Design a protein around this nucleic acid. Structure first.
Lengths: 124, 122
RNA sequence: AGAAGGAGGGAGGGAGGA
RNA sequence: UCCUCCCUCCCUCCUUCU
């Protein structure tokens, strides 16, 4: 029954409006950490269970970070970019300087590292 | 440690009155009391705070970390009308799935005189 | 996406008081 | 002229939670 990083992203993506929003990014981060730790299934199941509770798909993504334990243990991934323009418009409003040991299950999706040295966290 | 006392501790930390966390405090202390686990629940509450967690966070950690809250259904609370539910919880009401889990944020189930049931969901 | 708390503000309904 | 209570609705700020 095992699912693919490919189609999970597909599914979760089907469920959200907009393009390149903080939640599309969060989908990407969840699936990557998903693959590399062999939890794409645990993760799909929590996504479904949260929709059953009545959670908006945004909220469901959030529940994964808070309920699937891997995400309390892997830091938000660093993503090397040139400049802040490279980040999608929808995410612009959600960038914040990151504090020490930023946690995914606290809303820190990823860390954008630009070529001027400045790092900006994507905060949900 | 006592149920009455611990509720008052937990409350003294919470913002507002009549919020979902106030309801959760009552559920936690009720379950803790029926089951002789107030000591465990209090320790975990204090432990969360020491890690620097918000009191709201600490209550959630109890539901996730003290195993009893994985193994019992959300309490059924019987009420006259929906208007009997405090203002702060109103926007948090929603229909429960079949086996709502307390450790999934389902604080309790309000059963009205009409037989209709809404879960309080955090 | 949504909720709670505090703060600032703007519009309109019902009532009561100075 | 002002105040209080309740009911809609709109904007911004801080914190918390899912």
């Amino acid at each position: 029954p095992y699912i693919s990083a490919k189609d999970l992203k597909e599914i979760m993506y089907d469920h959200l409006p907009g393009f390149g929003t903080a939640f599309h990014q969060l989908v990407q981060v969840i699936c990557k950490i998903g693959k590399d730790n062999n939890l794409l299934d645990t993760i799909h199941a929590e996504f479904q269970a949260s929709l059953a509770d009545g959670d908006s798909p945004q909220c469901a993504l959030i529940q994964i970070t808070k309920r699937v334990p891997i995400f309390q243990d892997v830091p938000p991934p660093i993503i090397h970019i040139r400049s802040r323009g490279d980040i999608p418009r929808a995410c612009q409003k959600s960038l914040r300087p990151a504090p020490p040991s930023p946690k995914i299950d606290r809303g820190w999706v990823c860390l954008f590292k630009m070529q001027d040295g400045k790092t900006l966290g994507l905060k949900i």
